[model samples]
Target: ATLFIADLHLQTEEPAITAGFLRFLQGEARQADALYILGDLFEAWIGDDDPNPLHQQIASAIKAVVDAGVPCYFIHGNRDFLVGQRFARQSGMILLAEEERLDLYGREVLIMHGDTLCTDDQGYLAFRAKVHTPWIQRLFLALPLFIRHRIAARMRADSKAEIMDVNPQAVVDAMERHHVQWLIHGHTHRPAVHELQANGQPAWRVVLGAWHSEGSMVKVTPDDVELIHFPFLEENLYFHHH
Candidate 1:
């Protein structure tokens, strides 16, 4: 089985969520063939230089999962765009581009953080362009850790004040260009499987939920795909989507 998850937004402030992720890493994730973290694995990653306990623990959990033989892959999210090679190495993750194509169960699948498809959100698109610039990122990374943390907090707060949902047309266009039937992503915190149709083609979008009060993931096998949710420190399926 292949497991897909994102928008954990793990932070010290959310100890329960962190614990839930750890259980996932040790239990279901370790039993999988691979794990794909689309983005925002952390609440805010100032840099790999900050040896915060939360980061360390999460890294250790991921490392242990990889050590158990399952491969882990990651893509950048708005919150953790600063996650660099050092952190990737520590977490045993292969960093991928924002948008990537993969052969899943013999079918081409498109994977991303889902924010890029939210082209309707002009404010966030402008901010994303500015922050993602090479020079701007370098300058921000050079800032003091405290300052960067503060700025990240403010940006997250501001982002929450606005709407952030993907444009339906953008998603359809991307799927057509990529020639894929399935698209998976996380960002809007909406967890549902949407069946789509465009130009007489069949397609689907699988949105992963945020780990605010519970944990969610999409488990894919050769015969089935399901979105499953488990509560913090609790087990069993709260819900499942196909």
Candidate 2:
């Protein structure tokens, strides 16, 4: 079995979620063969260069999982696109392409952060394209952490403001493009197993939800994938998608 989780949005302001995440790392994740974190693992990742205590703690937690034999993987969700090799090493999380294709027990599954499928959001698409340029990212990473933190504040504020959902046709097209029936991703933050079709053949998508009062995960094996929700608290308001 494998564990899939994303959009934890880990930050200092909310220790409860982090506690719950630590519990997850030590609990459910240990029973799996592998772990796939599709993106937005943090509220904001300024850069790998910033030496934050919580970041270190998280790395240590994940590293323990990795050392114990669960192969951990990651993709750059829009929020934490700046995560680079240094942190990957510290956390022992293998990095994959934005659109990564994998064969799991003979099934070809397309793994992605899932924002690229949001073709309807032209503005965010353009912005995503611009910031992803190597030179631009290099410059941004070179700035003082304080300055980048200011920019981080602004960028995160944008998320606080309805982020659009994934496009249906785009989803169908991607499944066709990759020649895969399963598209597993976490950008939309809606926890559900969606049914779709391509070339008159059946296809599926497993959406991993955001972690607010609860944590969302997908447990997969050769036969099927299941979306599971376990909340940290019972009384908090339902914090919706990104």
Candidate 1 lDDT by residue in tens digits, 1-242: 89999999888888889889988898899889999999999888888899688888888899999999999999999988888999889989999999999888887789999999999888789988998999998998899989987987897798677437889999998898888899999998999989997446888999999988888999989998899988878665563466
Cα lDDT, model 2, residue 208 = 90
What local distance difference test score does each model get? 0.89, 0.88
The runs of at least 3 residues in candidate 1 whose Cα sits more than 4 Å from the true structure, single-residue gaps closed, are: 156-162, 198-200, 235-242
lDDT of 2 by residue, 41-102 (tens): 98788799898899999999999999999999999988889989999999999998888888
lDDT score, candidate 2:
0.88
State residue 1's C-alpha deviation in candidate 2, in Å: 0.5
Worst 10 residues of 2 by lDDT: 232-241
Candidate 2: residue pairs that collide: none
RMSD of each: 4.4, 5.4
What's the true lDDT of residue 136 in model 1?
A: 93
- Which candidate has the top score in lDDT? 1
Candidate 2 segments exceeding 4 Å error: 158-161, 233-242
